[PDB]
Amino acid sequence: AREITDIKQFLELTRRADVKTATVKINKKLNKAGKPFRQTKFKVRGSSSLYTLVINDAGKAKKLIQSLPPTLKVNRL
Amino acid sequence: GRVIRNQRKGAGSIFTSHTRLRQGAAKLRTLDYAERHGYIRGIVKQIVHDSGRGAPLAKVVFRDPYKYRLREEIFIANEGVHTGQFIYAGKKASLNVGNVLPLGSVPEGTIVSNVEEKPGDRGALARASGNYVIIIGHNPDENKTRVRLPSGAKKVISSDARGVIGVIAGGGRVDKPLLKAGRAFHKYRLKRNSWPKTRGVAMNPVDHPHGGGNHQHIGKASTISRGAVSGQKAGLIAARRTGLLRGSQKTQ
Amino acid sequence: AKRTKKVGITGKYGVRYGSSLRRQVKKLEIQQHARYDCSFCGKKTVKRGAAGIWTCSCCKKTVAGGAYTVSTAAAATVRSTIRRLREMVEA
Amino acid sequence: AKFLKAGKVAVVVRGRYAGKKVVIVKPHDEGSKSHPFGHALVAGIERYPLKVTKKHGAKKVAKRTKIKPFIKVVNYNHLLPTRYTLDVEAFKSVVSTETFEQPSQREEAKKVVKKAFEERHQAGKNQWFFSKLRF
Amino acid sequence: AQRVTFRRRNPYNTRSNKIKVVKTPGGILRAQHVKKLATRPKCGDCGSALQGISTLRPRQYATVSKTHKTVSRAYGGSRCANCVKERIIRAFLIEEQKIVKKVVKEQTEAAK
RNA sequence: GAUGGGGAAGCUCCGUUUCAAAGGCCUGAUUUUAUGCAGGCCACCAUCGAAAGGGAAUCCGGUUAAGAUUCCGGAACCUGGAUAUGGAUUCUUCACGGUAACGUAACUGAAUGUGGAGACGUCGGCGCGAGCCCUGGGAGGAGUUAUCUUUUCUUCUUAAC
RNA sequence: GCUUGUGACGGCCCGUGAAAAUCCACAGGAAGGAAUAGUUUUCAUGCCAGGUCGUACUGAUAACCGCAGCAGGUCUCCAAG
RNA sequence: UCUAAGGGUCGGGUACGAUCAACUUAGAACUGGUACGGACAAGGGGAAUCUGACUGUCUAAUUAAAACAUAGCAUUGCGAUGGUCAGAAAGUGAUGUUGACGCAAU
């Protein structure tokens, strides 16, 4: 139900006790008017809400993805 | 022979009153200490239409002398009493429109409404849109006051009996021709099942003392005795005279 | 463009009911629908709201009064008499 | 007089502090560059001393008599000028223009006026000024 | 073209059976029932819909923080501010005139 | 339509808050112990009566030979109950800010009182929303092509929350 | 444009067009509550639970009522060029 | 097949320009076996007499009328310890959440 943007505030969620699952979705999308790029949504399934963090930047993405809790059960795509 | 129409009304079935929409029964305050030793103030918090009544009602609220809270009475609004106006009720109350005083405390010629027959009966006389009673005089020893009702009837009552100064609003409602069946219809739709009326003369003999005949006609005198019996009384009951009232009326 | 010789508002009723009945009604309708002067705030913004109930556009005061007019002649002469009589009992 | 001067009591008549009583301590009778209106800087009483009685003893008395003050810049068209009047010398300095702007300044200010108002309540000076206006 | 059906059993157009059409991610029209509208709470004093106060159906007010049910000042969620201004003034003046009628008739009792 | 009642030979009739000693809650008092009494209220006095009136809260996709707002999947929400962690608040104890209308993530509140909502006709034009209808471009699939038509048809959707 | 929803208005009345459960708010301030550490679940997040009965289909020139698979009767929503 | 009239949006120191999008109406030519609201859709009119004013009502299943009702007009009863009406009775009931600008009865 909820969307998120503070990339630290998100990081805190990913370790918020009741969070067993997560999912990473990748989408082709366009930019301004010309070229395309690679959108990527970070979805933490809370017990009461499903949080999703859009990272527009492909670079920010990759480095974020590694930081994902090494105990967290993430579904890729 | 069938039971005739006026008899059927007594058993109250389709004939009862159409009561759902009505604001409440209108009554003066209960006759407590304050109202018969001093006065007590209220405020008309709203004047408002009562369904099937022709005069507006006035919701007027007071304090409970005995408990912390408001108690709201329902009054019949006299003419020219207005929202937010202060309302005074009591023996020792003042003589303006809207207030309510024992008839003992008002000079002759006072004009008052919703007047009690007995004290603390919370209003009985002159309540219909327009009417009032007039004080024609008092008699201090064995205390009474005499009034002339809307009927014209003189009648004397206890001077402790309360009245409210003024006449009742909505005067002249009966001046405007109803004009079409519908208005009468909607009129009674909020009173009772009294309309429209079949003439007994249009019915059969089972139906009425006026029923039958090969031409429509009453057949015998239609002045019926006081001592007549149920199912007999149709027409001009107890009538002591009859016909076009030639001449001025007005109680001598 | 004067619209009718004489029936005024009574036009709705067309030819029905008969002149006299309509005359009488026109009188009292013209009374009730009319807009009146407010005794309290001074603006003429009192229109009627059901038989007997006269209330004010702005300032929202409601005065009980005549069935189709704000002040009925009867109540008027009462007002004066209550004046008169009250006079006596303070002086 | 130009009756909105140094020590007038007045009742705030809008916004939170509505119905509460104040003292004028400084009057900007004409404008600010901001505050484009005649306006007073007042110290008022936000949470009055509750009543106290013989039944009240020792500490409960100490408790009942605590006062929550307040200070405010306010348009003249929000005070009822009152016939009453109380002295404002203890906190002339305390309630400044410069006292508003930057919160900590306002907090220390109220601290004084809190101690200022409570001294004044014991030995019932201005007794009226210490009783909620009811409405 | 595409038509639609009620979703509850009640077939009739009563206030509590308002409908509203809607396109789904299936790409088809379907009814959806629409609860009767909130009405704004009213200043129980002058009567106006009173400002600053969110507007729900009554039970739904228990599902909302108090800052949706008041404005700050005294008689907050209750009366219309301008209404309170009146309250304040009238109270003050009357309480004062109270005193003026005291010492005036207090003078009389001694001057007669 | 039961009840204290009143009629009636009786089946029963009347009455519904009415000539009635009509009841139950908040917690304190217990640290013999579970719940006696201590306050203080509240005198509202059965109940039945709406599958169209009032009314806490759910949606979209998928699935069956026959069920689906009920299963599956996903995402919500309400009510009762428990409860801790974070935040807020406090040395000026019970939030600040804004002249003000008012703001907010919070920001103690018993009895008692009061206010709102629930909650309300009908017709008329005006204004706006939604869905439908009409239509340009492009991206597809279809039909007609002796002849003519950058064509004719169709797909291009987005729930509650 | 069509249908529906809604708003600010206006016309009408001797017609002025339910009730109750229920939810909230306010006035009140009984009480209770901190500096060696208090108060706070109307902010957020977190934990458990939600019973009973109905849910098929017809709703009509054949599933209902008219002796019947009767040209009759029988409340309603959606509505293309 | 032509013509004229009726609109929207922008920038102008403190007269005009630019484009976008609507069927309404009136006029003018041409044109045909004089037809053209081409199907569908869709009032006969007039002069009087009788009778009920009107809209409304009824004999389901032989009478829809001039019959009933109606507004309007007039008469009667009644101030509650009451009028009129209900019940076998009654600490019973309708009008009555009522009060003569009312209720009841012709």
Ligand SMILES: [Mg+2]
């Ligand atoms: Mg009744």
Ligand SMILES: [Mg+2]
């Ligand atoms: Mg009838």
Ligand SMILES: [Mg+2]
């Ligand atoms: Mg008759």
Ligand SMILES: [Mg+2]
């Ligand atoms: Mg008749």
Ligand SMILES: [Mg+2]
């Ligand atoms: Mg006959």
Ligand SMILES: [Mg+2]
């Ligand atoms: Mg006879």
Ligand SMILES: [Mg+2]
């Ligand atoms: Mg006979």
Ligand SMILES: [Mg+2]
């Ligand atoms: Mg006969």
Ligand SMILES: [Mg+2]
């Ligand atoms: Mg005859």
Ligand SMILES: [Mg+2]
């Ligand atoms: Mg407070």
Ligand SMILES: [Mg+2]
């Ligand atoms: Mg299509």
Ligand SMILES: [Mg+2]
């Ligand atoms: Mg269904």
Ligand SMILES: [Mg+2]
């Ligand atoms: Mg409707």
Ligand SMILES: [Mg+2]
């Ligand atoms: Mg808000």
Ligand SMILES: [Mg+2]
């Ligand atoms: Mg608010």
Ligand SMILES: [Mg+2]
């Ligand atoms: Mg019984």
